[PDB]
């Protein structure tokens, strides 16, 4: 009976709520009052990259903090030298509608995808002197929203059809899939150990998955609207998410509950991208109001504002070593802040 | 320094080549106009697409009018939700919206709601929408047959009066023209309530099998780009 199952679900949800409440004897905000505030943070654009024609939608930092990959809706994928601003490659994509890009941990492969439902992987070996498509991973029933590399042979991709899948580059077919979501999946983040990865969907719920076991482990909720971004805390025991409701929240896997939420009354625009510093003390989040903000994770106090962009800040990324922060926007320009 | 200079010169040469390629591609990118095709589920989008032409998530069609490059994209295998992937088409020259003038439900109300949502979107406020009222011939038969739909579900049609600005074609009775202009005014009310002035609507009465649809689209695009230029030069 549908009424019986839907009542058992309500009972289980109430029990889960009670269990979560029982563990909240104290709040992170109260305890953090003893921590010294970081104070105002000064950031300026040190390098500006130009060459894109359409709005930039995604970018990814390299593993050496030297090379980065930029994806634009023009259909061109460009790799830039951060220190010298010299372009190293210009890959003309088959489809102009791009929505994400990724850089392999070893730097030998680059991947991208979009509304075509196909994930294309490019090889930088260039034995013949040119970059060509290594393989295309078709099979998704919805637009590919985000993708990340576990290694040179394994890639995790997400699509706007409620399905997350793991692909084998050599064989070119899905190995396992996740179907716990109900709305379109917007972004995914891989844990430092690569064993676990989180994904956000357009239903205000964040799901935790096990790559090896291939099934959900924990479910997090609390957002008032769709989730647009997600990023793991550097220690890997927590992550932060951004949603259209203009409030960021931090979730802890061990506690199975949100520890703190970042919000400002004067801010009404939603969050587009989020990223943490090397130590995780500083949280950087992009906003639709043509600027980015830096949040003190422990005190929930805005320590600065980055307003060097003229249009929506679509992507934001922090180097592995934290030397500088690269941000992109719909004005076809990249701003690197240090 | 010699070893460092060896890499620096190669980097400079690569940058020069990439810059030349990007400059070459810029001309073709700027010389082509991007268009989005959208409409109801069972609308006549397919017939119009084939007329212009004569598992993938998106389809693209290329055509040229008066030596003007036109690039159009039709949404393919995509889920019913649109509030996320629609934001991508914010830089297109215009949005082509096709609604049938007739599992079936009150399609016209759903089309009105979808058009209002598209018009009121924050990122789409800078993009003009070209509106095509398709299946007008079927509307004529449905009106002349006695059995009626608009008069049943639309109550305001009874009190409606044909505008004096109407320019109906010969050989058609007052009823079909009145219904067509009532639908047109229903669309214009939503498209003009905001009064922002940044984007405008271009209604059209077109049949499924119509040869001059390409000319309609070309004229609308010319008008849109020209109006944008006048706005840029501070006139409008």
């Amino acid at each position: 009976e549908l009424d019986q199952l839907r009542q058992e679900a309500e009972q289980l949800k109430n029990q889960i709520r009670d269990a979560r409440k029982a563990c909240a004897d104290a709040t992170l905000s109260q305890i953090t009052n003893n921590i010294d505030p970081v104070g105002r943070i000064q950031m300026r654009t040190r390098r500006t990259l130009r060459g894109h024609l359409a709005k930039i939608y995604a970018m990814h930092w390299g593993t050496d903090s030297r090379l980065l990959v930029s994806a634009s809706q023009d259909g061109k994928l460009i790799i830039w030298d951060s220190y010298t601003t010299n372009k190293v490659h210009a890959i003309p994509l088959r489809s102009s509608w791009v929505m994400t890009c990724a850089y392999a941990p070893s730097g030998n492969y680059v991947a991208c995808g979009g509304l075509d439902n196909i994930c294309s992987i490019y090889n930088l070996k260039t034995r013949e002197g040119n970059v060509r498509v290594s393989r295309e991973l078709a099979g998704h029933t919805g637009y590919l929203s985000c993708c990340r590399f576990l290694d040179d042979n394994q890639i995790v991709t997400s699509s706007g059809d409620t399905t997350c899948a793991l692909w084998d580059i050599e064989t070119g077919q899905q190995t396992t899939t996740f179907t716990g979501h109900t709305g379109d999946v917007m972004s995914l983040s891989l844990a430092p150990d690569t064993r676990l990865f989180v994904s956000g969907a357009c239903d205000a719920s964040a799901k935790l998955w096990d790559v090896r076991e291939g099934m959900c482990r924990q479910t997090f909720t609390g957002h008032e609207s769709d989730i647009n971004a997600i990023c793991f805390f550097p220690n890997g025991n927590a992550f932060a998410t951004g949603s259209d409701d203009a409030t960021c929240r931090l979730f802890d896997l061990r506690a199975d509950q949100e520890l703190m939420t970042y919000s400002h009354d004067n801010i009404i625009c939603g969050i587009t991208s989020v990223s943490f510093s090397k130590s995780g003390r500083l949280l950087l989040a992009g906003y639709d109001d043509f600027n980015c903000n830096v949040w003190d994770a422990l005190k929930a106090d805005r320590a600065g504002v980055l307003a060097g962009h003229d249009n929506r800040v679509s992507c934001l990324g922090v180097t592995d070593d934290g030397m500088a922060v690269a941000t992109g926007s719909w004005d076809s320009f990249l701003k690197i802040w240090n | 320094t010699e070893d460092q200079r060896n890499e620096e010169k190669a980097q400079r040469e690569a940058n020069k080549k990439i810059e030349k390629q990007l400059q070459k591609d810029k001309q073709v990118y700027r010389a082509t106009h991007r268009l989005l095709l959208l409409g109801a589920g069972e609308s006549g989008k397919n017939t119009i697409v084939k007329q212009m032409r004569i598992t993938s998530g998106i389809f693209e069609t290329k055509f040229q009018v008066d030596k003007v490059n036109f690039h159009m994209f039709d949404v393919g295998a995509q889920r019913d939700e649109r509030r996320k992937w629609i934001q991508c088409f914010n830089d297109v020259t215009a949005i082509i919206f096709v609604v049938a003038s007739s599992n079936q439900t009150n399609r016209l109300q759903a089309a009105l709601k979808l058009f209002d949502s598209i018009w009121n979107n924050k990122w789409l406020r800078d993009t003009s929408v070209i509106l095509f009222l398709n299946k007008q011939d079927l509307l004529a038969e449905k009106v002349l047959a006695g059995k009626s739909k608009i008069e049943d579900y639309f109550p305001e049609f009874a009190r409606y009066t044909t505008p004096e600005d109407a320019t109906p074609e010969p050989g058609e009775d007052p009823r079909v023209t009145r219904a067509k202009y009532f639908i047109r005014d229903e669309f214009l009310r939503i498209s003009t309530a905001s009064g922002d002035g940044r984007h405008y609507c271009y209604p059209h009465f077109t049949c499924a099998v119509d040869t001059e649809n390409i000319r309609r689209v070309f004229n609308d695009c010319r008008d849109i780009i020209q109006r944008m230029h006048l706005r840029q030069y501070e006139l409008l």
Partner: nanobody
Amino acid sequence: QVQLQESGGGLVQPGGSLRLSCAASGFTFSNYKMNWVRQAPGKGLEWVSDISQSGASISYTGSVKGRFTISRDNAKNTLYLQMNSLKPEDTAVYYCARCPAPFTRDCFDVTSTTYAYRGQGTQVTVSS
């Protein structure tokens, strides 16, 4: 978690009246637009009416314009849809759905057969 619960409704002879109430929780009810949708048997979802955040702007479908009425009270996070003069075609399951984003007048995926931000709904039936 955000949850929308519909209440009221039932079997009623034609020409009667019914009261439907929607309960909102887990979010700021005053910052989101509210909509009413129904799904008749053997037919897809269809929009019925919507009310702005402050209630100043109210609209109804032509088939129900002048018959039904909707109102909201942010002090209780409740939304209402008053039905009167029932007709045999009114039989349908009514869902209380919320506009996806706040501080905006655009709502896209209210009735796209998969909207997560809507309640379970209640059955409304009419018979002689």
